[PDB]
Amino acid sequence: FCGKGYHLMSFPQSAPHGVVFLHVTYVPAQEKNFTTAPAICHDGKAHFPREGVFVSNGTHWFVTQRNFYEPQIITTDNTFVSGNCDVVIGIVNNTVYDPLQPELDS
Amino acid sequence: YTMSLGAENSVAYSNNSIAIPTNFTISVTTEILPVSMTKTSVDCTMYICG
Amino acid sequence: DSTECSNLLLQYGSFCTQLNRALTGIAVEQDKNTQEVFAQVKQIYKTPPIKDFGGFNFSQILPDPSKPSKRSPIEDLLFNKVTNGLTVLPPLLTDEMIAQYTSALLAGTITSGWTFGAGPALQIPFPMQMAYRFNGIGVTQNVLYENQKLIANQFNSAIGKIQDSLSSTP
Ligand SMILES: *[C@@H]1O[C@H](CO)[C@@H](O[C@@H]2O[C@H](CO)[C@@H](O)[C@H](O)[C@H]2NC(C)=O)[C@H](O)[C@H]1NC(C)=O
Ligand SMILES: *[C@@H]1O[C@H](CO)[C@@H](O[C@@H]2O[C@H](CO)[C@@H](O)[C@H](O)[C@H]2NC(C)=O)[C@H](O)[C@H]1NC(C)=O
Ligand SMILES: *[C@@H]1O[C@H](CO)[C@@H](O[C@@H]2O[C@H](CO)[C@@H](O)[C@H](O)[C@H]2NC(C)=O)[C@H](O)[C@H]1NC(C)=O
Ligand SMILES: *[C@@H]1O[C@H](CO)[C@@H](O[C@@H]2O[C@H](CO)[C@@H](O)[C@H](O)[C@H]2NC(C)=O)[C@H](O)[C@H]1NC(C)=O
Ligand SMILES: *[C@@H]1O[C@H](CO)[C@@H](O[C@@H]2O[C@H](CO)[C@@H](O)[C@H](O)[C@H]2NC(C)=O)[C@H](O)[C@H]1NC(C)=O
Ligand SMILES: *[C@@H]1O[C@H](CO)[C@@H](O)[C@H](O)[C@H]1NC(C)=O
């Protein structure tokens, strides 16, 4: 409706008997393949991304936002737990880091 | 000639692969929309009869 | 073919030119409408040969290779269910090219979700895409993943009911 791509903003310009809209949009570019999984199996529990997606560069698993590649460590702060690993089709085994875990250890 | 609908692009679909963008383009496009016409008035008596 | 009639018709001026211009404008407007509706993608996307979409069946909406018209069964049923100076101009886009445009749109929305409409087509598994759509309407991803077989079965049943309803209602 407001240009090709994800619409960011628009600017109006007057024209003889008309209007010209300059649509400023965000276009994704330089995409890269990654291996993806619906959920992460850890300690018999299924972890799902809170806002992003699980991606793998070949050996390690990360969670990133869907519209830009920004890999982050899969922790308990950006994932949520729902059920065990027996139900979700395609769940893979990976560790889930706990930020509180070094705190009570020390 | 027979007109080409477009360039063929077979998306590499598989059940466990995703494509994530690593960059972006800020694209500005133009959209021209007419708003008004010239306001014309015709005197019917003067047009038909002078 | 009467010359005397045309000579008398010339006394009325450019009425015939006006009517021909209006009809020409309508005729080009129909082609413009078809371009605006169906030709919204400049890439002709194709589905993969293996139809592994996590239980989702699209055979009733994807084009049938066995048919020479390269239409879907639903589109084939739709085409079967629709039945002195005058000329009928053919449309600029034929039915097979319009079907090809719809096939490209279907392949894009199945293999890439909404990414192909906003830029380059980014591949994504179809259950994950459905989970994204679930999050769009405010339902968590887990609900989609846990009940994926049920959702796929309901979707296939609904598509079959659509074909049956179109085939059974005049
Ligand atoms: C996937 O990404 C991870 C994280 O960037 C990579 O792991 C790092 O690789 C560099 C390069 O040798 C090492 O110096 C780091 O020590 C690694 N970090 C960890 C935590 O192991 C990994 O190599 C990447 N894999 C591929 C195939 O690209
Ligand atoms: C992911 O981890 C689970 C548990 O750590 C694995 O499930 C085990 O698989 C072995 C071999 O099939 C069985 O003998 C065990 O009884 C299973 N344990 C449980 C609790 O189910 C699972 O195979 C792992 N998957 C992958 C791909 O590594
Ligand atoms: C992601 O991987 C797929 C498959 O490995 C790539 O698709 C191939 O691209 C090459 C480059 O032109 C083609 O010759 C092949 O025919 C493609 N294969 C298929 C099955 O389509 C794809 O290019 C990769 N994506 C990125 C961004 O590199
Ligand atoms: C993302 O894309 C931009 C272009 O839009 C890249 O910026 C260019 O980078 C090259 C090499 O680094 C320079 O020669 C150009 O002058 C840059 N152009 C502009 C407009 O700045 C940027 O490097 C890309 N970033 C990543 C991480 O891929
Ligand atoms: C997808 O749906 C189609 C049609 O709904 C299925 O095709 C049917 O397959 C059964 C068994 O092979 C046949 O008895 C029917 O006659 C077929 N119907 C039609 C219209 O051809 C198909 O099996 C489903 N699954 C896949 C993976 O394509
Ligand atoms: C993906 O497909 C492969 C076969 O190509 C299969 O072995 C694997 O189990 C599938 N994974 C899912 C999550 O469907």
Q: Residue B46: which region, alpha, beta or left (left: phi > 0; alpha: psi -120 to 50)? A: alpha
Could you tell me if C73 lies within 8 Å of chain A, comparing CB atoms? no
CA distance C110 to C133: 12
Can you read off the two tokens belonging to residue A51?
């806002």
Query: Which chains border A (3 or more CB–CB pairs < 8 Å)?
Result: B, C
DSSP state of C49: S
- 3-state class (DSSP) for residue A45: strand
Q: Tokens in use for C129?
A: 């895409």
Instruction: Name the closest-CA residue to atom 19, ligand 3.
Output: B12
Answer whether C144's CB lies under 8 Å from C134's CB: yes
* Rounded-to-integer distance, Cα A2 and Cα A24, Å: 8
Q: Resolution, in Å, please?
A: 3.0
The whole-angstrom separation of Cα B18 and Cα C125 is 7
Q: Which residues line ligand 2 (CB under 6 A)?
A: A 41, 93
C7-to-C1, C13, C16, C84 alpha-carbon distances in Å: 11, 11, 13, 19
| Cα torsion C47, C49, C55, C57: sign | positive
* Amino acid in the structure at residue A42: H
Q: Of C147, C125, C142, C150, which Cα lies nearest the Cα of C54?
A: C125
Contact present, A83 and C146 (Cβ < 8 Å) = yes
- How many whole angstroms separate alpha carbon C170 and alpha carbon C168? 7
Computed over its alpha carbons, how large is the radius of gyration of chain B? 28
Ligand 5, residue C57: give the atom nearest the CA. Answer: 1
Whole-angstrom Cα Rg for chain C = 24
CA atoms within 13 A on the CB side of A82: 17
Three-state SS at C158: helix
- According to DSSP, residue C109 is labeled H
- How far is residue A15's CA from residue B32's CA, in Å, rounded to a whole number? 9
Instruction: Burial-class residue B1 by CB neighbours within 10 Å (0-12, 13-18, 19+).
Output: exposed
Calpha distance C54→A38 (Å, rounded)? 12
Interface of B with A in 20-49 (CB under 8 A): 20-38
End-to-end CA distance of chain B: 55
C95-125 exposure pattern, b = at least 16 Cβ within 10 A, e = fewer:
eebbbbbbbbbbbbbbbbbebbbbbbbbbbb
What residues does A21 pair with on adjacent strands? A12, B31
Residues 6+ apart with CB under 8 A from A11: A21, A22, A24
Which chain B residues are within 8 Å of A24, Cβ to Cβ?
A: 26-28
The Cα A80–Cα A101 span in angstroms is 17
8 A C-beta contact, residue A41 and residue A93 = yes
- CA–CA dist A5, B26 (Å, integer): 9
Instruction: Give the closest-approach CA distance of C162 to chain B in angstroms.
Output: 27
Asked whether the CA dihedral C127, C128, C129, C131 is positive or negative, the reply is positive
Angle formed at CA C30 by CA B28 and CA C118, multiple of 5 degrees = 25
Q: CA-to-CA distance for A19 and B34, rounded, in angstroms?
A: 6
| Nearest atom within ligand 2 for CA of residue A93 | 1
How far is it, in rounded angstroms, from Cα A54 to Cα A65?
9
Q: What experimental approach yielded this model?
A: cryo-EM
